[PDB]
Amino acid sequence: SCPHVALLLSSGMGHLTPCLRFAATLVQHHCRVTIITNYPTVSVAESRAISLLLSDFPQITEKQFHLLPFDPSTANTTDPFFLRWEAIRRSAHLLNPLLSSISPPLSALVIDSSLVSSFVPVAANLDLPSYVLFTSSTRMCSLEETFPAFVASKTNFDSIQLDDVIEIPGFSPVPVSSVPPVFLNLNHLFTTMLIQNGQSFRKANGILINTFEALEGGILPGINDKRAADGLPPYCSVGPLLPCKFEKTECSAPVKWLDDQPEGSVVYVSFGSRFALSSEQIKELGDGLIRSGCRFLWVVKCKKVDQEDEESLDELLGRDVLEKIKKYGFVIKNWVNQQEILDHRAVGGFVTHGGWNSSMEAVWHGVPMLVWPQFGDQKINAEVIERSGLGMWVKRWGWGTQQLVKGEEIGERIKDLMGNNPLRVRAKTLREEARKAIEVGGSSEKTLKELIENWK
Amino acid sequence: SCPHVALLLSSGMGHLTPCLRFAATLVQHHCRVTIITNYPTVSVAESRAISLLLSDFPQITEKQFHLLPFDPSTANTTDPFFLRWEAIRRSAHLLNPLLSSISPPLSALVIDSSLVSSFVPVAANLDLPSYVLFTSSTRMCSLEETFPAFVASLDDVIEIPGFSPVPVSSVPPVFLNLNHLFTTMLIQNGQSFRKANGILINTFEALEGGILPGINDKRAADGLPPYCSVGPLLPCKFSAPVKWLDDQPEGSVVYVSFGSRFALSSEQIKELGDGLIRSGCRFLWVVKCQEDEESLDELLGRDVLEKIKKYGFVIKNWVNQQEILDHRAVGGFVTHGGWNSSMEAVWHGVPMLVWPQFGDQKINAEVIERSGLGMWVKRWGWGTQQLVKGEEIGERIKDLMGNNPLRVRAKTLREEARKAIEVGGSSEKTLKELIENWK
Numbered sequence: 014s015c016p017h018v019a020l021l022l023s024s025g026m027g028h029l030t031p032c033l034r035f036a037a038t039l040v041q042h043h044c045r046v047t048i049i050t051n052y053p054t055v056s057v058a059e060s061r062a063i064s065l066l067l068s069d070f071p072q073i074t075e076k077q078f079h080l081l082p083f084d085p086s087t088a089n090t091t092d093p094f095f096l097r098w099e100a101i102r103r104s105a106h107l108l109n110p111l112l113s114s115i116s117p118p119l120s121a122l123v124i125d126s127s128l129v130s131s132f133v134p135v136a137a138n139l140d141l142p143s144y145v146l147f148t149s150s151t152r153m154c155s156l157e158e159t160f161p162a163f164v165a166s167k168t169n170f171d172s173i174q175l176d177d178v179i180e181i182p183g184f185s186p187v188p189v190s191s192v193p194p195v196f197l198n199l200n201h202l203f204t205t206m207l208i209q210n211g212q213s214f215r216k217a218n219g220i221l222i223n224t225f226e227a228l229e230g231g232i233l234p235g236i237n238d239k240r241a242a243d244g245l246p247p248y249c250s251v252g253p254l255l256p257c258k259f260e261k262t263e264c265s266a267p268v269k270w271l272d273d274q275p276e277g278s279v280v281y282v283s284f285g286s287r288f289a290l291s292s293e294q295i296k297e298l299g300d301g302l303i304r305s306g307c308r309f310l311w312v313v314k315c316k317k318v319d320q321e322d323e324e325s326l327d328e329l330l331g332r333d334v335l336e337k338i339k340k341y342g343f344v345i346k347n348w349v350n351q352q353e354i355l356d357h358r359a360v361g362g363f364v365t366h367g368g369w370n371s372s373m374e375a376v377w378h379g380v381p382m383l384v385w386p387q388f389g390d391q392k393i394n395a396e397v398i399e400r401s402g403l404g405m406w407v408k409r410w411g412w413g414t415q416q417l418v419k420g421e422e423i424g425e426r427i428k429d430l431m432g433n434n435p436l437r438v439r440a441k442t443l444r445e446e447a448r449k450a451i452e453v454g455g456s457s458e459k460t461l462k463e464l465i466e467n468w469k
Numbered sequence: 470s471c472p473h474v475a476l477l478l479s480s481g482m483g484h485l486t487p488c489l490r491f492a493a494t495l496v497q498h499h500c501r502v503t504i505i506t507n508y509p510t511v512s513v514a515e516s517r518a519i520s521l522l523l524s525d526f527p528q529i530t531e532k533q534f535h536l537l538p539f540d541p542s543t544a545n546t547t548d549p550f551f552l553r554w555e556a557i558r559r560s561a562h563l564l565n566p567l568l569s570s571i572s573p574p575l576s577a578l579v580i581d582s583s584l585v586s587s588f589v590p591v592a593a594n595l596d597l598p599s600y601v602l603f604t605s606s607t608r609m610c611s612l613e614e615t616f617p618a619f620v621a622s623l624d625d626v627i628e629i630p631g632f633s634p635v636p637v638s639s640v641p642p643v644f645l646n647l648n649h650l651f652t653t654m655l656i657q658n659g660q661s662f663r664k665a666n667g668i669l670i671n672t673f674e675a676l677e678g679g680i681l682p683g684i685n686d687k688r689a690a691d692g693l694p695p696y697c698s699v700g701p702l703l704p705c706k707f708s709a710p711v712k713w714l715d716d717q718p719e720g721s722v723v724y725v726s727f728g729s730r731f732a733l734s735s736e737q738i739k740e741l742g743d744g745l746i747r748s749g750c751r752f753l754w755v756v757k758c759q760e761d762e763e764s765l766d767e768l769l770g771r772d773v774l775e776k777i778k779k780y781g782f783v784i785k786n787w788v789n790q791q792e793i794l795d796h797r798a799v800g801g802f803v804t805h806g807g808w809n810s811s812m813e814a815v816w817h818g819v820p821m822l823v824w825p826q827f828g829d830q831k832i833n834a835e836v837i838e839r840s841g842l843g844m845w846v847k848r849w850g851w852g853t854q855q856l857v858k859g860e861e862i863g864e865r866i867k868d869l870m871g872n873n874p875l876r877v878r879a880k881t882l883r884e885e886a887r888k889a890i891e892v893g894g895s896s897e898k899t900l901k902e903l904i905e906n907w908k
């Protein structure tokens with residue numbers, strides 16, 4: 014028997030990447046994977062990823078979910094990715110015919126974390142075991158579970174709220190300063206969805222996380238038996254989730270440029286797929302990279318959605334400035350193969366926004382990190398990284414969205430990143446442990462095997 | 470459920486390519502696949518290929534087959550690949566525990582066309598349904614099955630079922646040389662094809678008329694195992710010559726390769742180089758002389774080597790033939806007529822000039838010629854047997870490049886081949902039915 018698993022995706026590369034990689038892992042562990050997609054994708058990158066995955070894996074079936082006509086006026090945010098999540102969630106009662114059509118009969122439904130609350134009852138109607146796919150760190154999962162109780166505890170998130178902690182079971186408490194800024198905005202669409210989903214994580218048969226136990230002390234078994242005692246579903250560490258072979262094109266111009274550089278001399282700089290720095294910050298970062306005195310590779314976005322970023326970098330920085338920066342290092346306003354870049358020998362360090370996918374990529378490839386949180390989960394994930402010893406995160410810089418950092422200080426901190434030996438020593442060890450987790454008999458291998466063995 | 474299929478390989482890239490590609494295919498059709506391998510492989514290509522497949526497909530298990538120690542004293546042939554088949558065949562009794570060992574329970578076993586006679590009984594003992602993986606054309610398979618009865622019974626017609634006759638001229642030369650290792654082994658295999666449950670052939674119906682579905686009912690009447698067409702077997706997901714090809718106009722390059730295990734005479738290499746220069750066309754030339762340490766500079770010369778480089782691309786190495794054939798610049802293919810390269814040309818829609826040198830090629834060429842996709846010079850005979858001068862070569866290449874009906878046929882047949890393995894297609898259907906019966 015080869016267990017049938019259907020995966021329910023949402024919008025956004027941050028959510029999509031671990032879903033596709035998990036599909037690849039499942040297929041490569043003798044399971045039937047069917048992906049439930051929706052179109053048109055908010056960004057091209059998503060569509061391309063789906064197409065490539067399908068071309069490499071013809072045995073994965075794709076069922077398109079047809080969303081009900083959507084009225085954006087009802088929605089609180091102008092953010093496309095969130096808007097799509099809600100668009101899917103409002104057409105939840107039409108998953109039932111979809112799922113009923115599928116053959117062979119389904120063993121399991123993996124549902125994205127963003128759409129849990131709306132779609133877990135649909136899985137209940139058909140006696141379908143449901144598992145949430147969690148795209149962020151474990152600490153963040155706990156925070157998301159604990160948050161609804163916390164907002165229920167308070168009269169209002171008024172000025173009474175200062176930077177004091179939120180209690181998390183089995184974890185170090187989280188300061189309000191590290192808490193996602195949108196959380197304080199109750200009635201924000203994302204916040205509403207987060208309260209609902211965080212409330213609904215308990216309903217699923219299990220919570221899948223992209224991590225390994227060594228990455229976060231040895232707290233996870235204890236937390237899990239405690240959860241079992243309280244009747245909560247278990248955390249399943251199935252990470253690190255390995256990139257597919259299609260994610261590697263060894264003929265990229267950035268890679269070719271990287272080949273001619275001294276080893277461990279390049280600094281990689283990127284801030285995710287769904288977020289663009291402010292113009293001032295782009296300029297100052299430009300200054301800082303030159304001021305660092307190091308070789309660098311810089312991925313710039315001037316808009317969140319890749320389709321919309323028509324503007325050239327010649328428009329913002331302008332004329333001779335961009336040329337000047339170009340002399341010092343590789344600059345690009347285009348989609349790059351990031352994992353492939355992280356594996357390169359020339360790359361000594363990573364300036365990241367703290368997104369969990371890229372963070373885990375650096376953990377897997379053993380690249381020291383300089384974390385520059387911008388919003389959301391990223392101040393928490395940062396902390397994790399810092400505790401691992403693989404990276405450092407500058408607290409003086411605060412949130413990137415609400416604070417500006419000048420070129421000089423950027424330069425100095427980058428120099429700090431390049432000079433730090435302990436980070437590099439830890440990188441190797443944590444890298445090898447990361448390997449051991451997914452080796453046969455590893456934590457993640459054991460967990461995965463158990464999951465499939467339940468299905469069975 | 471995930472049916473478990475075993476692939477029994479034999480030495481030879483020509484046999485191994487369809488094997489590995491069939492592993493990929495079966496995996497892609499929700500089957501578990503275990504490959505049975507033997508070491509040390511004769512050539513590096515086989516080893517590296519297996520490595521690449523196993524790397525790209527972690528869900529495929531590899532079971533090393535150990536063989537009885539063999540003496541090359543008989544050795545009716547000096548061919549390494551053919552000798553390997555004797556090595557594996559003589560150790561057939563060692564196969565039973567091996568095949569009994571694999572879990573989950575095998576639902577079927579696929580065995581190479583070279584070792585059928587000796588390894589089809591092993592299946593019967595374990596109630597294991599067995600299929601033969603045939604590498605060559607439908608016509609050639611028919612001939613192989615038809616030959617034993619023919620030996621039991623000059624350049625005239627040999628009897629074939631469900632097909633136009635074959636001139637003994639077209640018959641592989643080694644058939645005449647009885648008590649050759651190849652001939653003997655083959656005589657053993659052909660009479661044993663019937664023991665197998667089905668015949669897996671890399672082909673589609675549109676490639677050889679509308680007779681293919683009928684030969685199956687006709688065979689069913691005679692109690693013969695059906696011919697199951699699973700082709701075209703697509704290449705698997707696993708740069709300098711390509712980089713050169715990108716600087717070239719569309720349909721302006723002639724591609725020249727004569728297979729994995731064959732090498733031209735020095736004289737013929739000289740004359741082919743001459744014909745390539747005299748052709749007036751850009752070209753990519755793949756040269757063969759694993760034991761090939763001597764540079765092309767040695768054989769051709771150094772002063773001679775420089776002249777050819779000016780008008781084309783010359784290489785003495787393994788190439789990604791399919792990657793080169795899918796390219797737009799390549800307007801035509803000069804091939805030996807092997808079934809894999811021919812099939813890749815059909816898939817990439819490349820017009821071809823066939824130059825049969827030995828083996829099954831003479832049949833294949835006909836098929837090629839019969840399809841309208843390519844042209845073959847009957848005048849040239851066997852390349853191993855005959856030498857051709859530069860003028861004829863160049864002129865004939867000009868004929869190939871100038872040929873426009875071939876391009877049309879190439880497009881249309883590319884479409885047929887594509888439609889074959891799409892859902893509802895003739896080729897995919899037979900696969901679906903096969904896997905459905907496993908069950």
Ligand SMILES: O=c1ccn([C@@H]2O[C@H](COP(=O)(O)OP(=O)(O)O[C@H]3O[C@H](CO)[C@@H](O)[C@H](O)[C@H]3O)[C@@H](O)[C@H]2O)c(=O)[nH]1
Pocket residue numbers: 026027028030148149283284285286287288312347348349350351352367368369370371372374388389390391
């Ligand atoms: O030029 C690029 C840009 C992005 N990526 C990939 O995009 C993926 C996702 O990036 P990620 O690190 O997850 O951050 P974001 O997707 O931009 O942002 C949100 O996406 C996830 C949602 O759970 C969270 O991990 C993040 O904290 C959250 O900020 C990574 O694997 C990157 O390798 C590339 O390969 N090339």
Ligand SMILES: O=c1ccn([C@@H]2O[C@H](COP(=O)(O)OP(=O)(O)O[C@H]3O[C@H](CO)[C@@H](O)[C@H](O)[C@H]3O)[C@@H](O)[C@H]2O)c(=O)[nH]1
Pocket residue numbers: 482483484486604605726727728729730731755786787788789790791806807808809810811813827828829830
């Ligand atoms: O430089 C090279 C040479 C060969 N190939 C590949 O080798 C494969 C097999 O070659 P093939 O066309 O099958 O001919 P051979 O293997 O050299 O010769 C024997 O191999 C097969 C055994 O059945 C038959 O198809 C042939 O007629 C028979 O002559 C092809 O797919 C080619 O793509 C390459 O990729 N690069």
